[PDB]
Structures are given as C-alpha cells and as structure tokens.
Amino acid sequence: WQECMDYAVTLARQAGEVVCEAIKNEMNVMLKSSPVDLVTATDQKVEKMLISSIKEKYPSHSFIGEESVAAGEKSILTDNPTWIIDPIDGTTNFVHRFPFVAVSIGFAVNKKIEFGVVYSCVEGKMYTARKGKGAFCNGQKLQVSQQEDITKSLLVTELGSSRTPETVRMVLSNMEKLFCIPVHGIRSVGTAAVNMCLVATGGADAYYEMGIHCWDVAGAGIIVTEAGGVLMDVTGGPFDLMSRRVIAANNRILAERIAKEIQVIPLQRDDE
C-alpha cells in the first residue's frame, strides 16, 4: 500500500495543478442529470488522467470514478484494491470560482479504506492519512476538536443536489431541528471532502449529509478517523460507504446526538 499511496500523492498534486490553471480560464459548462448537476471538460479530463496513470502502474486494480459511472460504468465495491476518485469535488464552486475545490483519491482493500488523499487546490493544502499512521495537512499532524456538548458545537452540511420540494423541505426541516437545540451555528463551503477536512482539523465539530456518493467521502473519511474522529450512518448504525449517508464527527457523543435529531431521506444507493 505505501508505494500506491506516494504515487497517489504525486498524482493528486499534479491533477490539482491542472484544476488550478483551469479555474481562471473560460469553461465549457455542461449538464449531467438536471440544470444544477454540472460537469465541465476539466472534470472529465482529470478523471481520465488519474485512471490511465493508475492503470499503467497497477493493471489489476478496480476503479470507481464519478465521470466513469456517468459514462455507464458501475459502482459495486469488491475486495479488489479499488481506487475511488472524484476529480473535482466542488464542481459548482469551480464553475463560479468560489475558492474551495478538491481532488479526492480514496483507496480500499477488502472493502475497507486504507488511505486517503484530498488536495484543496486554491488553498494549496494536501491532506493525507493512512490507517494506523495519523492524518496530516502539508506535514502537520491533525486532531479533531474536544467538544462533547451539542449546544456548543459548530456543524457543517450542504443543502444537496435535489430541488424536489419534498426532499428540500426534509433537508431544511433537519437543519431546523439542529439549529434550535441550539447549536452555535451551521456552515457550508460547498464540497463534502473540504467539509470533512475542516472537521479533521478541529475547525468544525461535525459534518452530516444525505445524498453524497462514495467518491465524495472515500478519501476524507479516513482523514477524519485518523485525526481521531468518528464515522457513522444517520440511523446511528455503522457507516456504509455506498448508502449515501454519513455523519463524520469529532467523537461518538455528538454523532449519536445528531443521528437522534435528524430524519432519514429516501435515496437510491450507489450499489443499486
């Protein structure tokens, strides 16, 4: 695994260089499933780069990538060394030049995540973690916050990709329950990976969301657990990479409390 990991880091860093030049040029903005689900030619270009480079040195391995699944590929995770890639987490941010866009590379062996690389381009911050070895941002070790009281916590979440009134009302209703506990506040920078990395640095205490996909959270989940945090399903049960739901918190006390307060939204899983 370490050989794979340091290749992943040189790859994440050059894919990030591509994204950072592209953000300052004109862009072709295209639509995937709706007027608000967006893709650009840079997304597709970076995933092609990443998957071809990895196949070259590791032909035996599997790949789950956002744009590949958009081009009809499948997201079923098997025990084979799988690379789970999102070339640009933050495409809406990227299109707008809102300054938070990340490349996320997650690696799973036996359906368990072994390492994660998340590179935030505009900030120039590389976050990395390998199981048992700690979580880092540009060499500095990270640790989650120590907060255990929900009325003193700062949470991060997103409003989601749907615009169906009933799903939207459920998202907002869940934000209302949390907000009125009361919590100190809720933030949204626009990318699931960066939201989870801010939890790993201790800047936020918890992140929760329903509607994400495995490629958005694969790389950052292990940066959270290796910074001392916790991953959990919104049922309060164990985290399932393919279920489209995640609570990533500094500790089990806040995660359980968030799960107790929010209601599950119906969604198709990534392996269905």
Place this chain on the structure above:
Amino acid sequence: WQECMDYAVTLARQAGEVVCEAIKNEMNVMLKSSPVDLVTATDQKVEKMLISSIKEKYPSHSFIGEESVAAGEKSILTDNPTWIIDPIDGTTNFVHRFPFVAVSIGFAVNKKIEFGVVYSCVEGKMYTARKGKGAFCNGQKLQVSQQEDITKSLLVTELGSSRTPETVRMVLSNMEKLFCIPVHGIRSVGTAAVNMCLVATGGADAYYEMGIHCWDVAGAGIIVTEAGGVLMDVTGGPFDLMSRRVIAANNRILAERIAKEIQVIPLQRDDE
C-alpha cells in the same frame, strides 16, 4: 481621507496579528444576549486598542464599535467623521478555530462610507476600497461576476443569530424559495464581511441577510460597490446602514429578483 485610510490599513494588520496569535490559544467564551451571541476577551481587547490608536491620531472623530455599544455606548451616525468598527467579525468561527475571521473598519463622513478595510486574518488577505478608486485584495483589482440569470447564481447567506421558532422558520422559508427557483447553491462561511468580500471577487453572485448590524457591513459594503456591485435593502428600497438588512449583489437584476422572493422579518434598528 487618504492618510486616515493608510493608517487604518496599518491598524487592521496589527489588530489582525493580535487575533491570529489569540486563535491558537484556549479561550474563555462569554455570552452577551443569548447563548449563541458570543464574545471573548480578544474582541474587547482588539476593540479598545483600535479606538485608542485612532483617538490618539484623530480626537475629533466619532466611533461606532460593537463591544462599545454592548458597554452602553450609542450607535448614532451623524455627518461627523465616524469610524465604524467590528474587532472580530466571526467570533463564533474564532472560538472554534473555523478559519474565516475578519477585522472590519468602515469610515463615514456625512453619513456615506468613504473607505473600508476588511482583513481576513487566518488567510492573510487584506481587502480595501476607497470611493471612486476601486476595490483591491492584496494589491489585485477586484470585479464582480457578470451573471444576470438567477437560475445560474451562487448565493451566500447566514442562518442568523436568532433561534426563536418563528424567525428561524422565516429564514429557512426564505431560503427554500430561492433554492427552488433553482439557483446553483447557497454557501455560509460564518461572517458577513467575508461573505460580502467573496461577492466582490466574483466568487459568489449575491449575499443577502437580515439581523446584521452596521458594524458587520460598513467596511465590506464599499468593497462590493467599488468592485462593480450594488447594495440594496431586502425590500428593494435604498441600502440603509442602520436597518439591519442588506442585499450586496453583482448587479441590480439579481438584487431585485432576490428582493422579490424573500419576505422581511421585523427588526429593531441600530439607531433606536
């Protein structure tokens, strides 16, 4: 006014250094009017520092500061040279080490903002604007985005300091109307002054909020207009620095469209 402005940029960088050393330490958080309305000793220290230094060089000048008003001073704006200060915009972010924290200085003469300085401490980004002279971030000229189509905008807003069931429901109800137009998304970085500065850079298209105060928006408002944007009331009327409500937008087509969808919350003015 240019000498005042050169001084004011020196002060903001100094105060900003105080805030950035202070963020790395343990803090005693105090409460003001509710359990989510926070203040720390640094808020007060940086504010008394800013007013002492300016009052040394400029003894005829008036001041509106957040903690000074919290200490019984009055928020009235007259045609006198007035410095409008918030020592730390983003106290809740400061407390959690969530990295968007700003020092803000607006200077008004004849009740009109002449110049404004906002220093985002943890990023090391100094934003400045002088009427008729343009807005800059660290020496780089800024320009708002060109978007005139609401269904393709990215908006920033906050969830507000109130936690009264009714007000929270109107804030979220207003947010649901805009979300469902649709728009591309909504972000919240935790501070009025940095949210407005992201509109000035073209990274977001508009910012709206009700419940803010004249010290939160005095420094950043001039930066948005000198970058090519407009400030307006949520009612569509003229922007009033004391009415607790603002739309800072790239242009009047987007600002008026946002004013159409959202409903006003009754608020108690700053000058009463």
